[PDB]
Amino acid sequence: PQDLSEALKEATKEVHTQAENAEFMRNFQKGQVTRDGFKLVMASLYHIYVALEEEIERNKESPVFAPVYFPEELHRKAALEQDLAFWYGPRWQEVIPYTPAMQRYVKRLHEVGRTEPELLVAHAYTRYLGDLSGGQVLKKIAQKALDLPSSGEGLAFFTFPNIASATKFKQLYRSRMNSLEMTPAVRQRVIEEAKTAFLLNIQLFEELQELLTH
Ligand code: HEM
Ligand SMILES: O=C(CC(c1ccccc1)c1ccccc1)Cn1ccnc1
């Protein structure tokens, strides 16, 4: 496919199905989630977005990422910090878990950030465009299963307040990915790193399930 947006969607089909048939998400679809499990997800998303956004800020000026840079529209660190404060208490930053599977993901983002930033779009595509697609339904499932209090906190991550229409922004975000100047050789590594990105996610759900069910 000529468009990067199409080429990434085409390449990741087998790895996305592999991620749908992850043991954790197999249960999540049927609404078989616990508070413990959700907390782990929420903590995972924190460590990943902290690293992703840290590396994005390093490379916002660079032509390899500048077009897809949407700080205000997409930033998730603060939303997640608000949630972890509710899930783990005001001393969340001292008590939240940092598992090896999380560490691998975080290590990759920091390596891609410093040594090959032209691939950072692959992770940005995976994380943002991924979490922008599923959030609405995944919240509806979580909300039903967890039966949390009327405290008005803890699910802030699932709302992108500076994005009016998710569908229109995804359109826009795809256009900006299509406008990225890159040799058909880097084009290869972006697709390969996107595959790597999915692998790290599935690998995470596997370590999470090994922890939750003893
Ligand atoms: C419960 C497990 C999952 C299900 C049922 C699922 C299914 C879906 C659905 C229904 C969409 C909406 C399609 C759209 O309107 O664009 C989507 C999009 C997407 N998902 Fe998932 N998914 C799951 C897990 C994952 C994981 C673990 C990742 C990797 C981080 C991922 C990455 C993506 C991406 C990048 C898109 C946007 C595709 C595009 O438009 O280019 N998904 N998926
Ligand atoms: O699956 C998605 C987010 C998912 C998740 C969590 C941690 C790491 C990677 C993914 C998650 C978020 C919040 C609660 C339960 C699960 C986005 N998605 C939906 C459809 N296609 C992509």
- C-alpha–C-alpha distance, residues 126 and 110, integer Å: 16
What's the one-letter identity of residue 19? A
Q: How far is CA 23 from CA 20, 66, 126, 198, 206, in A?
A: 9, 37, 20, 15, 7
What's the one-letter identity of residue 200? L
Q: Where are the alpha helices (DSSP H) in the chain?
A: 4-11, 13-20, 23-29, 35-58, 71-74, 77-88, 92-95, 100-115, 120-124, 130-146, 166-178, 186-212
- C-alpha–C-alpha distance, residues 76 and 79, integer Å: 5
**Chain-centre distance of CA 129, in angstroms?**
8
Asked if 6 contacts 177 with a C-beta cutoff of 8 angstroms, the reply is no
Between the CA of 127 and the centroid of ligand 2 the distance, in Å, is: 9
SS (H, E, C) 104-141: HHHHHHHHHHHHCHHHHHHHHHHHHHHHHHHHHHHHHH
What is the Cβ-side half-sphere exposure of residue 205, based on CA atoms within 13 angstroms? 17
Three-state DSSP at 159 gives coil
Question: 16, 52, 202: which to mutate for ligand 1, most atoms within 8 A of CB?
Answer: 16
What is the Cβ-side half-sphere exposure of residue 121, based on CA atoms within 13 angstroms? 28
The count of other CB atoms within 10 Å of the CB of residue 209 is 17
This structure was determined by X-ray
User: Quick one: tokens of 173?
Assistant: 């975000």
User: Quick one: tokens of 206?
Assistant: 């596997």
Q: Which fold has domain 1-214?
A: Heme Oxygenase; Chain A (1.20.910)
User: Quick one: tokens of 184?
Assistant: 């058909």
Residue of 127, 186, 168, 187 lying closest to 3 (CA atoms)? 187
What is the Cβ-side half-sphere exposure of residue 151, based on CA atoms within 13 angstroms? 13
Between the CA of 143 and the centroid of ligand 1 the distance, in Å, is: 20
- C-alpha–C-alpha distance, residues 46 and 50, integer Å: 6
Determine the atom of ligand 1 nearest the C-alpha atom of 127.
Answer: 30
End-to-end CA, the chain: 44
Asked if 178 contacts 5 with a C-beta cutoff of 8 angstroms, the reply is yes
What region, left, alpha or beta, does residue 147 occupy, with left being phi > 0 and alpha being psi -120 to 50 degrees? left
| Residue ranges lining ligand 2, Cβ < 6 Å | 28, 41, 44-45, 130-131, 133-134, 138, 201, 204
User: What's the CA dihedral at 96, 97, 102, 107 to 10 degrees?
Assistant: 80
Asked if 51 contacts 106 with a C-beta cutoff of 8 angstroms, the reply is yes
